Amino acid sequence: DDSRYTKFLTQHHDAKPKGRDDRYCERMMKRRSLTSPCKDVNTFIHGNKSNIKAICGANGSPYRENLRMSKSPFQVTTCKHTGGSPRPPCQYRASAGFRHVVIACENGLPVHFDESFF
């Protein structure tokens, strides 16, 4: 199973986060295998999976040509690589907030997160 929906959950869903700071980002990027090489920017969305899937239906609106914007905010933590080394150990700075998100959907399921919106 290398479905794009499975990959989206591995990279972007953590329902009940243990922290929301720089150490949470360093731990979680390593646990989800996003450190070989260091991924430059990656956001985790918190809360239940059902609310994220509903962005692809009535709880999202079309945004630009092929994306979709949530109608309500979500708790999120964005992790940004610092120090410019693509090689691990990978250091990260966190930015937590309660923000609308923009994703792409295919067949009713989330398959890409637009990091450029933040």
PDB file of C-alpha atoms in Angstrom:
ATOM      1  CA  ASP A   1       0.000   0.000   0.000  1.00  0.00           C
ATOM      2  CA  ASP A   2       1.631   3.157  -1.296  1.00  0.00           C
ATOM      3  CA  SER A   3      -1.675   4.992  -1.732  1.00  0.00           C
ATOM      4  CA  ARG A   4      -1.486   8.770  -1.629  1.00  0.00           C
ATOM      5  CA  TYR A   5      -4.128   8.832   1.125  1.00  0.00           C
ATOM      6  CA  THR A   6      -2.027   6.537   3.393  1.00  0.00           C
ATOM      7  CA  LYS A   7       1.062   8.736   2.717  1.00  0.00           C
ATOM      8  CA  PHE A   8      -0.990  11.870   3.652  1.00  0.00           C
ATOM      9  CA  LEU A   9      -1.939  10.378   7.060  1.00  0.00           C
ATOM     10  CA  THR A  10       1.701   9.268   7.751  1.00  0.00           C
ATOM     11  CA  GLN A  11       3.054  12.734   6.981  1.00  0.00           C
ATOM     12  CA  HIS A  12       0.263  15.038   8.223  1.00  0.00           C
ATOM     13  CA  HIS A  13      -2.011  13.516  10.928  1.00  0.00           C
ATOM     14  CA  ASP A  14      -1.346  13.388  14.726  1.00  0.00           C
ATOM     15  CA  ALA A  15      -4.636  13.383  16.604  1.00  0.00           C
ATOM     16  CA  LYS A  16      -3.473  14.026  20.145  1.00  0.00           C
ATOM     17  CA  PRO A  17      -0.039  15.693  20.157  1.00  0.00           C
ATOM     18  CA  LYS A  18       2.338  15.372  23.108  1.00  0.00           C
ATOM     19  CA  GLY A  19       3.655  18.875  22.704  1.00  0.00           C
ATOM     20  CA  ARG A  20       3.571  21.687  20.179  1.00  0.00           C
ATOM     21  CA  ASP A  21       7.161  22.927  20.325  1.00  0.00           C
ATOM     22  CA  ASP A  22      10.615  22.432  18.747  1.00  0.00           C
ATOM     23  CA  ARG A  23      11.292  19.120  20.579  1.00  0.00           C
ATOM     24  CA  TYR A  24       7.879  17.731  19.463  1.00  0.00           C
ATOM     25  CA  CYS A  25       8.847  18.505  15.834  1.00  0.00           C
ATOM     26  CA  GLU A  26      12.304  16.852  16.100  1.00  0.00           C
ATOM     27  CA  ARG A  27      10.776  13.673  17.656  1.00  0.00           C
ATOM     28  CA  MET A  28       7.820  13.419  15.274  1.00  0.00           C
ATOM     29  CA  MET A  29       9.775  14.023  11.971  1.00  0.00           C
ATOM     30  CA  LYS A  30      12.116  11.176  12.992  1.00  0.00           C
ATOM     31  CA  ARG A  31       9.205   8.851  14.023  1.00  0.00           C
ATOM     32  CA  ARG A  32       7.400   9.354  10.688  1.00  0.00           C
ATOM     33  CA  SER A  33      10.678   8.758   8.730  1.00  0.00           C
ATOM     34  CA  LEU A  34      10.914  12.289   7.296  1.00  0.00           C
ATOM     35  CA  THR A  35      14.637  12.811   8.114  1.00  0.00           C
ATOM     36  CA  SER A  36      16.559  11.016   5.305  1.00  0.00           C
ATOM     37  CA  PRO A  37      16.979  13.530   3.843  1.00  0.00           C
ATOM     38  CA  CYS A  38      15.652  16.278   6.207  1.00  0.00           C
ATOM     39  CA  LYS A  39      12.264  17.401   4.870  1.00  0.00           C
ATOM     40  CA  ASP A  40      12.257  21.230   4.652  1.00  0.00           C
ATOM     41  CA  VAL A  41       8.744  22.046   5.928  1.00  0.00           C
ATOM     42  CA  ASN A  42       5.969  19.713   7.145  1.00  0.00           C
ATOM     43  CA  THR A  43       2.661  20.440   8.936  1.00  0.00           C
ATOM     44  CA  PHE A  44       0.824  18.054  11.337  1.00  0.00           C
ATOM     45  CA  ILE A  45      -2.951  18.472  11.670  1.00  0.00           C
ATOM     46  CA  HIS A  46      -4.513  17.575  15.074  1.00  0.00           C
ATOM     47  CA  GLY A  47      -7.975  16.303  16.039  1.00  0.00           C
ATOM     48  CA  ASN A  48      -9.987  13.483  14.435  1.00  0.00           C
ATOM     49  CA  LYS A  49      -9.503  11.998  10.940  1.00  0.00           C
ATOM     50  CA  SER A  50     -13.221  12.401  10.027  1.00  0.00           C
ATOM     51  CA  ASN A  51     -13.059  16.208  10.154  1.00  0.00           C
ATOM     52  CA  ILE A  52     -10.052  16.238   7.758  1.00  0.00           C
ATOM     53  CA  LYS A  53     -11.780  13.940   5.216  1.00  0.00           C
ATOM     54  CA  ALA A  54     -14.861  16.259   5.263  1.00  0.00           C
ATOM     55  CA  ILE A  55     -12.745  19.085   3.693  1.00  0.00           C
ATOM     56  CA  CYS A  56     -13.076  17.061   0.467  1.00  0.00           C
ATOM     57  CA  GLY A  57     -16.900  17.388   0.720  1.00  0.00           C
ATOM     58  CA  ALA A  58     -19.196  19.956   2.260  1.00  0.00           C
ATOM     59  CA  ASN A  59     -16.697  21.281   4.806  1.00  0.00           C
ATOM     60  CA  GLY A  60     -14.276  22.627   2.124  1.00  0.00           C
ATOM     61  CA  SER A  61     -14.568  25.093  -0.822  1.00  0.00           C
ATOM     62  CA  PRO A  62     -12.670  25.108  -4.109  1.00  0.00           C
ATOM     63  CA  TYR A  63      -9.481  27.168  -3.857  1.00  0.00           C
ATOM     64  CA  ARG A  64      -7.620  28.176  -7.033  1.00  0.00           C
ATOM     65  CA  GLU A  65      -7.624  25.666  -9.900  1.00  0.00           C
ATOM     66  CA  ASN A  66      -7.224  22.323  -8.162  1.00  0.00           C
ATOM     67  CA  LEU A  67      -7.091  22.803  -4.327  1.00  0.00           C
ATOM     68  CA  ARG A  68      -9.652  23.033  -1.490  1.00  0.00           C
ATOM     69  CA  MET A  69      -9.754  25.299   1.598  1.00  0.00           C
ATOM     70  CA  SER A  70     -11.299  24.270   4.920  1.00  0.00           C
ATOM     71  CA  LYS A  71     -14.401  26.186   6.062  1.00  0.00           C
ATOM     72  CA  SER A  72     -13.290  26.100   9.726  1.00  0.00           C
ATOM     73  CA  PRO A  73      -9.890  26.295  11.419  1.00  0.00           C
ATOM     74  CA  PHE A  74      -7.881  23.349  12.746  1.00  0.00           C
ATOM     75  CA  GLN A  75      -5.247  23.018  15.423  1.00  0.00           C
ATOM     76  CA  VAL A  76      -1.918  22.571  13.512  1.00  0.00           C
ATOM     77  CA  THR A  77       1.838  22.432  14.182  1.00  0.00           C
ATOM     78  CA  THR A  78       4.184  23.367  11.327  1.00  0.00           C
ATOM     79  CA  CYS A  79       7.818  22.094  11.547  1.00  0.00           C
ATOM     80  CA  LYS A  80      10.485  24.035   9.627  1.00  0.00           C
ATOM     81  CA  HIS A  81      14.071  22.725   9.074  1.00  0.00           C
ATOM     82  CA  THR A  82      16.861  24.983  10.427  1.00  0.00           C
ATOM     83  CA  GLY A  83      20.651  24.859   9.905  1.00  0.00           C
ATOM     84  CA  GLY A  84      20.419  23.983   6.202  1.00  0.00           C
ATOM     85  CA  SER A  85      21.939  20.486   6.442  1.00  0.00           C
ATOM     86  CA  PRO A  86      19.954  17.932   4.355  1.00  0.00           C
ATOM     87  CA  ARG A  87      21.799  15.304   6.432  1.00  0.00           C
ATOM     88  CA  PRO A  88      20.540  14.102   9.854  1.00  0.00           C
ATOM     89  CA  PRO A  89      20.274  14.795  12.759  1.00  0.00           C
ATOM     90  CA  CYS A  90      17.554  17.177  11.573  1.00  0.00           C
ATOM     91  CA  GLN A  91      16.821  20.261  13.709  1.00  0.00           C
ATOM     92  CA  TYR A  92      13.357  21.893  13.516  1.00  0.00           C
ATOM     93  CA  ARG A  93      11.570  25.021  14.750  1.00  0.00           C
ATOM     94  CA  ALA A  94       7.801  24.724  15.476  1.00  0.00           C
ATOM     95  CA  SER A  95       4.961  27.160  14.683  1.00  0.00           C
ATOM     96  CA  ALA A  96       1.628  26.101  16.302  1.00  0.00           C
ATOM     97  CA  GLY A  97      -1.712  27.778  15.574  1.00  0.00           C
ATOM     98  CA  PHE A  98      -5.456  27.491  14.878  1.00  0.00           C
ATOM     99  CA  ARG A  99      -5.661  28.121  11.132  1.00  0.00           C
ATOM    100  CA  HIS A 100      -7.618  27.255   7.959  1.00  0.00           C
ATOM    101  CA  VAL A 101      -5.801  24.671   5.806  1.00  0.00           C
ATOM    102  CA  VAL A 102      -5.539  24.065   2.044  1.00  0.00           C
ATOM    103  CA  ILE A 103      -5.221  20.493   0.662  1.00  0.00           C
ATOM    104  CA  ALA A 104      -5.797  18.561  -2.582  1.00  0.00           C
ATOM    105  CA  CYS A 105      -8.393  15.743  -2.733  1.00  0.00           C
ATOM    106  CA  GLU A 106      -8.733  12.797  -5.137  1.00  0.00           C
ATOM    107  CA  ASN A 107     -11.631  10.255  -5.041  1.00  0.00           C
ATOM    108  CA  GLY A 108     -13.004  12.005  -1.930  1.00  0.00           C
ATOM    109  CA  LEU A 109      -9.776  11.601   0.097  1.00  0.00           C
ATOM    110  CA  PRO A 110      -6.978  14.018   1.129  1.00  0.00           C
ATOM    111  CA  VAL A 111      -3.797  13.404  -0.882  1.00  0.00           C
ATOM    112  CA  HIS A 112      -1.529  16.518  -0.581  1.00  0.00           C
ATOM    113  CA  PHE A 113      -1.056  19.409   1.931  1.00  0.00           C
ATOM    114  CA  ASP A 114      -0.227  22.891   0.508  1.00  0.00           C
ATOM    115  CA  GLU A 115       2.597  24.115   2.762  1.00  0.00           C
ATOM    116  CA  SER A 116       2.849  27.379   0.784  1.00  0.00           C
ATOM    117  CA  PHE A 117      -0.461  28.705   2.103  1.00  0.00           C
ATOM    118  CA  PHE A 118       1.089  29.486   5.537  1.00  0.00           C
TER     119      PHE A 118
END
